[PDB]
Design a protein around this nucleic acid. Sequence first.
RNA 1: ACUCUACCGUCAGGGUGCCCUGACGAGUAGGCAGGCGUGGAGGUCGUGACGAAGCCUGACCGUAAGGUCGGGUCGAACGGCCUCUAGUGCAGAUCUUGGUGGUAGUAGCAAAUAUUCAAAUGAGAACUUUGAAGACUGAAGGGGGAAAGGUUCCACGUCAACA
RNA 2: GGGCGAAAGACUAAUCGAACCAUCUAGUAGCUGGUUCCUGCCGAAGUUUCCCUCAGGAUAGCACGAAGCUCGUUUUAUGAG
RNA 3: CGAGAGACCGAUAGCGAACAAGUACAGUGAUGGAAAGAUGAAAAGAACUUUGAAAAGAGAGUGAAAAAGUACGUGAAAUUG
Lengths: 71, 109, 205, 150, 116, 52
Amino acid sequence: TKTRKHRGHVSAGKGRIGKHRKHPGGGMAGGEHHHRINMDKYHPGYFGKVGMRYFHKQQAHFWKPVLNLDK
Amino acid sequence: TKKFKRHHSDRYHRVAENWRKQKGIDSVVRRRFRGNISQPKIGYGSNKKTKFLSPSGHKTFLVANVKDLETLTMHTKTYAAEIAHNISAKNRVVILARAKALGIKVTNP
Amino acid sequence: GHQTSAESWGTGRAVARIPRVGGGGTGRSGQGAFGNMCRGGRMFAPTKTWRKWNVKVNHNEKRYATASAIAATAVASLVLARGHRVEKIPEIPLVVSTDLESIQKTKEAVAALKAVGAHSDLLKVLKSKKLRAGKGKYRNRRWTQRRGPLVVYAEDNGIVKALRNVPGVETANVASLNLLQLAPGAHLGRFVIWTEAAFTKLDQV
Amino acid sequence: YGATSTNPAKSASARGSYLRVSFKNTRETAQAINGWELTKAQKYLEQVLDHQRAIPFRRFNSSIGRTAQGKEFGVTKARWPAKSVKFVQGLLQNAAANAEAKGLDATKLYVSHIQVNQAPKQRRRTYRAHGRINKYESSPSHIELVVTEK
Amino acid sequence: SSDRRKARKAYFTAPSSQRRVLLSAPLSKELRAQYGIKALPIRRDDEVLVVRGSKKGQEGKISSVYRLKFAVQVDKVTKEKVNGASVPINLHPSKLVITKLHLDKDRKALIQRKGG
Amino acid sequence: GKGTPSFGKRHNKSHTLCNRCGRRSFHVQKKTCSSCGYPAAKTRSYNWGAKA
RNA sequence: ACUCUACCGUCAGGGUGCCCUGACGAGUAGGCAGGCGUGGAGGUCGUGACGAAGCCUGACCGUAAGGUCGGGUCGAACGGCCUCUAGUGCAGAUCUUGGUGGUAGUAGCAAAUAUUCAAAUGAGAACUUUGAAGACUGAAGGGGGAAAGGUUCCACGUCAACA
RNA sequence: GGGCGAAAGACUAAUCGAACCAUCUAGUAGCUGGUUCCUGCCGAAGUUUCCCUCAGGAUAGCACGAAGCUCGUUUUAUGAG
RNA sequence: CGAGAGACCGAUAGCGAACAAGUACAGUGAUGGAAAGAUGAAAAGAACUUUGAAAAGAGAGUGAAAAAGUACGUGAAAUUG
């Protein structure tokens, strides 16, 4: 929303002139190999699985109070 | 003394002649030249000492409508001491009959 | 914008690759809504009802802000500066009795404000207001009533209609006494006329 | 028009606007009678409308014949306009008629103004081959003739 | 609502019931001080007078009243023609004020019905 | 050129006009109609016949 | 440059108000700061028909940004104060909405079936119309029906647009 | 993707190697082009580990912006053509 | 169908369209579809006189002003004396 800097330069949201979908590298990226995207020799991606999922830690799992002895 | 323009104005009409920055790559006044004009810097211009002329260096005070009339002086506002044009001819004549009747010059009669 | 069809064609005829003329199209360009640089196609940022206007705020800032704005009334200099005025400089904000409720007509109301000394806030409007530009010249934005002295009620709910009708006044309650009623147009310090029962209802925060 | 009605006591004129007519031939005919007084002017137009003399063209060029009758100034080229000239001759006639209505010295008056204006187009179309329509528009010459008191 | 053209919408394509009223002009001071009424609608054989205008405070009558046009011809505001005919000539009835109100059958009972 | 003067034959007259609508693809052979139908079943208002 | 001395730019220290004053200051990306900016608005009094916005023209401070005053003129609109909000600064993709320029009054002026002369009428006549006379075709410039179209024929009536 | 062949994908409203019209559709373009105030503070880089990777980009080299602090001239030797 | 209002336009905007915009027109064709607003208080919209053939050009009247004259707001330039 810096209308002064953005419209009187047109570099804001772009960078240098011919930067199109090479620069963000498409949008997303996958797991394994592909050409000219933002994947490369990255450290995130691997493992994938979100959540500490187990059949003990779901429904009917009763919660504990926040209760120290000195607190 | 060498007057300034925006460049390419002498070529075609699609140029606003007020000064714009020489934006991207090469231009004769970018890499600094004193011939085909210059690029305006803060080295040029009037200094931190002065400001505001008349043939007696006198600053104005616009006394438009009958809001604050009794504020106009006859010292630094001796030469320039105007009214306001957008404010009616009725008010103009009323202010002038007080303002110029201090002991000052005003441009309009 | 999609109320026309205009196609690409290119060279071989007098039209560009840009959708200008096709299946119709006089000064109605675009295949759908396309061509903002083209006149009668689309817009750059076409305004939408989906995008936000209404925003959040704290409730604990609401009761602080009304307290701060009325604290600016208790200093006399803030009041008489901005736009609001007063003859009686000390003992601000003004507190009258519950005889404010015993006012029927605006003829009696103007006379009451005359006597106590809150009348230079009342008479201040000389000429009216005509219009101003845009949606100022179109709809109900012509005649506006001055936010002059505020009147504050006590016993809640049904406030005084007698002191709606004073030239350049407001009516309000002690509980219902919002942000715009104390600080209209940013800066603080609007004159408030309380009653006896209203100013002891104000003994909360 | 171009020129003013310099005073209605001195003036006498006649218009002739929005004509389908050759554009260069109207103002080139106008040159050779402008400045010249009305008795010389009317003679020149009735000569070139008949067979006698040409009008030497000056302001305009194009493929036009140089010949012995190119003299008006030190000019070589000329052409001999006809249906253009019959229009301009009518303006000399009415301006001289209404100059006697004022009570001047009509035939001996100075021709102050005559040229031609153009601005909007009078849009006409004619066809050409291959499902085609090209421009076929007329040039609206605004021909006046002011005489002043002389 | 608060709208110039959309307020005029109702005035323009007004029904014939409302066009009775919208043939309006004020009443004179001794008609108000006789009865009470603000305005009453304007008809042909009323004696009329011009309020605001250069035709200032002159005597007149009305010649014609018109339904859709709203404008009325005013007698005594009379010019000629190129052919030379002394015609009554138009005015919009807001520029007028009536001095006559008739009694009649039961316009007598209209102005003194249930409220009056 | 194969086109326009050959189309100027038109001995076989395909389409005439519709009664209810004005869609003149009312073929004497096929008896079709792209608009409301002639003959119809229900009113043939089709959704793809508009963009806006 | 070297060199004299002064002046312009941000910041430091001593002591507020800021002044002394060091070191450097060619410049494209880029970031920050500061300043000028439209539509709109809580505000709104102030200005107005004894002459408002506007149109048009002159004066016209100096930091690059574009704004106050004044004159000719308008016949109703809009800013002190005080601060928040948006479709917010133009020279350009063989682009987009239209007029106007350009070649140009130049070419074209429609497949080589001669035309000459006299009149009627009239404001104007080679062309309408009529006469004298000649070119020209006569398996069509003669004659004549269906599809297709649908009143275009006809008499009456006009010379403007339009040929 | 059917109609059709003594063949030439000739042929289907000037479109036929898959008719035309309309809608979903503003399909999409890893590529190219165009793109709107000013001054001041102040201002580099064309180098690399590495890739089914090559007109790109994770990382590193170098100076952005902001807060808090940070030299060497040269003397004794030691290692290597 | 009616009413009211929103930080919501003032003839390139917005409903196709403010106005005889589906009506002089164009396509076989559900369809495409332009040009396009306008006096004053009162029309009194120029009698009468004079010149020219109508067009065109001058005196004279009406009216608050004709420095409001019907093609009726303010008006710039290419064009154009």
